[PDB]
Design an enzyme around this catalytic site. Structure first.
Site, PDB file in Angstrom:
ATOM      1  CG  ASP A  61     -41.269  16.887 -51.555  1.00 46.21           C
ATOM      2  OD1 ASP A  61     -40.784  17.149 -52.655  1.00 46.21           O
ATOM      3  OD2 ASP A  61     -40.881  15.943 -50.821  1.00 46.21           O
TER       4      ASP A  61
ATOM      5  CD  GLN B  67     -33.657   4.473 -38.907  1.00 46.48           C
ATOM      6  OE1 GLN B  67     -32.836   4.834 -38.051  1.00 46.48           O
ATOM      7  NE2 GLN B  67     -33.604   3.288 -39.507  1.00 46.48           N
TER       8      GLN B  67
ATOM      9  CB  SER C 145     -33.168  14.392 -46.235  1.00 46.57           C
ATOM     10  OG  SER C 145     -34.517  14.659 -46.572  1.00 46.57           O
ATOM     11  CG  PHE C 146     -37.381  12.077 -42.827  1.00 48.09           C
ATOM     12  CD1 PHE C 146     -37.553  10.957 -42.040  1.00 48.09           C
ATOM     13  CD2 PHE C 146     -37.667  11.984 -44.189  1.00 48.09           C
ATOM     14  CE1 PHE C 146     -38.037   9.781 -42.587  1.00 48.09           C
ATOM     15  CE2 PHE C 146     -38.130  10.791 -44.738  1.00 48.09           C
ATOM     16  CZ  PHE C 146     -38.296   9.689 -43.933  1.00 48.09           C
TER      17      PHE C 146
ATOM     18  CG  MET D 214     -48.091  -1.335 -42.586  1.00 52.68           C
ATOM     19  SD  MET D 214     -46.367  -0.818 -42.479  1.00 52.68           S
ATOM     20  CE  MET D 214     -45.643  -1.817 -43.787  1.00 52.68           C
TER      21      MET D 214
ATOM     22  CG  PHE E  16     -47.244   8.140 -39.918  1.00 51.14           C
ATOM     23  CD1 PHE E  16     -48.162   9.151 -40.118  1.00 51.14           C
ATOM     24  CD2 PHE E  16     -45.914   8.469 -39.731  1.00 51.14           C
ATOM     25  CE1 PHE E  16     -47.760  10.468 -40.086  1.00 51.14           C
ATOM     26  CE2 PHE E  16     -45.503   9.783 -39.751  1.00 51.14           C
ATOM     27  CZ  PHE E  16     -46.423  10.784 -39.940  1.00 51.14           C
TER      28      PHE E  16
END
Ligand SMILES: Cc1cc2cc(-c3cc(N)nc(N)c3)ccc2o1
EC number: 2.7.11.23
Length: 337
Positions: free
Chosen positions: A147, A32, A29-30, A100, A98
């Site tokens: 979440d 990709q 939703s954010f 991997m 980030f």
């Protein structure tokens, strides 16, 4: 100026003479997540590209603040949280770089054909996740993930048990109420379904649900909607305590108070097992060779092992958020001895 909110990313292109875009890891939703080679550091990175949308940019700025806050701590415990390397604006999108990682715990269940991983591997994921929750419960952090699910817990390496938590996009700190609906439905705590105040204990509820699923292959509580969710919780755990329901703003969404002051299930418009009769002892197969009997005649799956596992989970699935086992005490459980 583009019309869509999404960033156009071409496999093979190179950003800022540094990042070589390999492939799409996944969409959300954010926005990709792309796999890219950082030619400067000579390493793979996972680039989280945020959509050009105000709601998602705001969530991502909360995520950047909470990850940078966690990074200032010295403890080894902080390495159970995905490492944010840097962030920048590119083509007018916020981009989070980030480390991997490898595949998520849902991909791991799918590779078992949803038959579940061993109790020994379940114990390893349990210990790491309890240490990660202890880290978030550090007073100066007081972070609620809000979440947790198999999809948000990732192996570091495809051949090893080490794991990290991702996605603090829905997260808050103790005492905050920001979003109308929080937690994934299957992993949604009873205090959140009931519209009661929530604290770090909601994450320990989610973890209890996740660990049963990792060993059985199937979600413990697979509700199609909030009423179904609460009803499947009641099948296993019975009617919540009166002292909770008497204070719950949304008690009457699921339950009814009888003349004597006791609570029952709300009548359907017009199907569930009676309250508390779907025993977790039988879901796990404690005395009957584990899930579907498939662990009988394997080691690391004794009745003694299963009873310790069941007892820890039922403390993680306590209806009362004030008495639910806390990360500090969960790590001392005989399941980890
Ligand atoms: C393989 C791989 C997938 C992956 C996904 C993330 C990530 C995804 C989301 N949504 N939020 C955060 N905070 C991290 C990080 C590293 C990754 O590595």
């Amino acid at each position: 100026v583009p019309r869509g909110s999404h960033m156009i990313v071409k496999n093979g292109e190179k950003w800022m003479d540094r990042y070589e875009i390999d492939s799409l890891i996944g969409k959300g939703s954010f926005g990709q997540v792309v796999k890219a080679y950082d030619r400067v550091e000579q390493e793979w990175v996972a680039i989280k590209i945020i959509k050009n949308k105000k709601a998602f940019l705001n969530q991502a700025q909360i995520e950047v603040r909470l990850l940078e806050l966690m990074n200032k701590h010295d403890t080894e415990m902080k390495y159970y949280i995905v490492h944010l390397k840097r962030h920048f604006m590119f083509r007018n999108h916020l981009c989070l770089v980030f480390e991997m990682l490898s595949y998520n715990l849902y991909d791991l269940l799918r590779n078992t054909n949803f038959r579940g991983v061993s109790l020994n591997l379940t114990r390893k994921f349990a210990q790491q996740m309890c240490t990660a929750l202890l880290f978030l419960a550090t007073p100066e952090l007081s972070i609620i993930h809000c979440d947790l699910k198999p999809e948000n817990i990732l192996l570091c390496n495809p051949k090893r048990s080490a794991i990290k938590i991702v996605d603090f996009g829905s997260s808050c700190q103790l005492g905050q109420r920001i979003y109308q609906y929080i937690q994934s439905r299957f992993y949604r705590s009873p205090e959140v379904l009931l519209g009661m105040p929530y604290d770090l204990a909601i994450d320990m509820w989610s973890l209890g649900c996740i660990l049963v699923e990792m060993h059985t292959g199937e979600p413990l509580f697979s509700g199609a909607n909030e009423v179904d969710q609460m009803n499947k919780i009641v099948e296993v755990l019975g009617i919540p305590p009166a002292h909770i329901l008497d204070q719950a703003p949304k008690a009457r969404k699921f339950f009814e108070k009888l003349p004597d002051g006791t609570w029952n299930l709300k009548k359907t418009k017009d199907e569930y097992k009676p309250p508390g009769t779907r025993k977790l002892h039988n879901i796990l197969g404690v005395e009957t060779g584990g899930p579907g009997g498939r662990r009988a005649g394997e080691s690391g799956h004794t009745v003694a092992d299963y009873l310790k596992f069941k007892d820890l989970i039922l403390r993680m699935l306590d209806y009362d958020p004030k008495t639910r086992i806390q990360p500090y005490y969960a790590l001392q459980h005989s399941f980890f001895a």
